[PDB]
Design a protein around this ligand. Structure first.
Ligand code: VCN
Length: 289
């Protein structure tokens, strides 16, 4: 599309911000808030509609994991509730295949989900599919050549370098090569033929290391690291470049927005969000109005 939308996030409490960045001119636009604050959600786009999936409302009033699915229409600048998932999913991962949305992992209280479910926008319905071989919260999810990939996370006791791949026509999950680094809460996306895992938390430190998985060779290789360590970051791809938004570096909730150009293997700073925050949902679609 044209704009990078960032929904929700966390700074001292869960947030309801929806803001859109325009890489063409550097400008941010504040849009309609989410009806319910939430961090740890995921964002995605189908048919020019933006979707906020899962998450958790951390608030003074209390803490409520979200099973919600809310759609935003850029034309109207309005949110509508969609059907809820079978179960709340905080620190969720999502991916889109064939106009269908896959919700992966996440926590509900102290439950750490291995379950997965699929939303069909034309019927406004969710259905459970095969569970991952591993429980994963704070899991990175990406789609490549119509296969779904779950990368890293936290299974309840250990944080994971493991990764697995879902094969829809077989309704089956299989392990792939693990990463070289343990990561939970990394930004995971797809560029060209590789799956990128950036940043995250390895149990001790927030990471700035970035690595990528080549589906042909089935290996992970590090690329240039980000200028900032960060976990619970937002990530997306726009015109051949990776954008990472916010996160937590162990000291500050970052407003930094970094851009990776794969041809030069460099990260440059590109803008600041209007305020520091972690755990945002991020997606890309056309301009509002
Ligand atoms: C994403 C993985 N984790 C925790 C789940 C951290 O990186 C982390 C580690 C130590 C302290 C803190 C965090 C963290 C993450 C997101 C928001 C706030 C904090 C925060 O105080």
């Amino acid at each position: 599309g044209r704009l990078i939308y960032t929904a929700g996030g966390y700074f001292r409490q869960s947030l309801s911000y929806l803001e859109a960045y325009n890489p063409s001119n550097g400008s941010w636009l504040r849009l309609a808030d989410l009806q319910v604050p939430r961090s740890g959600l995921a964002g995605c786009v189908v048919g020019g509609l933006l979707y906020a999936v899962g998450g958790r409302n951390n608030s003074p009033d209390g803490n409520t994991d979200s099973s919600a699915l809310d759609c935003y229409n850029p034309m109207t600048n309005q949110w509508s509730p969609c059907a809820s998932m079978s179960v709340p999913r905080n620190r969720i991962g999502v991916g889109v295949i064939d106009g269908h949305i896959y919700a992966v992992g996440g926590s509900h209280g102290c439950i750490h989900h291995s379950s997965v479910e699929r939303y069909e926008p034309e019927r406004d319905e969710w259905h459970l599919v095969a569970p991952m071989l591993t429980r994963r919260i704070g899991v990175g999810v990406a789609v490549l050549n119509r296969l779904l990939y779950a990368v890293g996370g936290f299974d309840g006791t250990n944080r994971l370098n493991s990764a697995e791949c879902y094969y829809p026509e077989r309704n089956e999950w299989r392990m792939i090569t693990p990463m070289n680094t343990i990561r939970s809460g990394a930004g995971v996306c797809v560029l060209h033929n590789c799956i990128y895992a950036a940043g995250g938390y390895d149990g001790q430190d927030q990471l700035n290391s970035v690595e990528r998985y080549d589906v042909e060779t089935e290996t992970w290789t590090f690329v240039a690291p980000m200028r900032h360590h960060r976990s619970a970051l937002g990530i997306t791809v726009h015109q051949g470049k990776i954008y990472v938004l916010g996160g937590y570096d162990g000291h500050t909730f970052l407003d930094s927005v970094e851009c990776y150009d794969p041809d030069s293997d460099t990260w440059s700073e590109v803008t600041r969000m209007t305020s520091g925050r972690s755990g945002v949902g991020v997606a890309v679609t056309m301009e509002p109005c």
